[PDB]
């Protein structure tokens, strides 16, 4: 799997209601998405 990494410092912004809650392979909570999601980074 490829990792998407923040290209800039800033504030992440997205509507987290569009995405399903999940537990990651590492036990971390995460969102699992099955759409094209646009994430803002307010740098």
């Amino acid at each position: 799997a490829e990792h998407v990494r923040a290209p800039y410092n800033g504030k992440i912004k997205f509507n987290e209601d569009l995405v399903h809650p999940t537990r990651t392979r590492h036990g971390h909570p995460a969102f699992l998405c099955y759409i094209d999601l646009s994430v803002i980074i307010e740098s």
């Binding site: 399903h20 809650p21 999940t22 537990r23 909570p29 699992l32």
Partner: protein, 52 residues
């Protein structure tokens, strides 16, 4: 898996203390009363003593 159980989604939301704060304000129970109430016996309280 993307979590499906309402109770597991609720636990996922409770992972933020701010959401717990909002649940406190919505239910109206004071937050120390809720910290107490989390210690409540989980169920099946025994039949009351009838001592004569």
């Amino acid at each position: 898996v993307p979590l499906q159980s309402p109770e597991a989604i609720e636990a996922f939301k409770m992972l933020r203390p701010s959401y717990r704060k909002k649940k406190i304000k919505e239910m109206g129970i004071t937050e120390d009363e809720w910290y107490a109430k989390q210690f409540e016996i989980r169920g099946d309280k025994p039949p009351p003593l009838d001592t004569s």
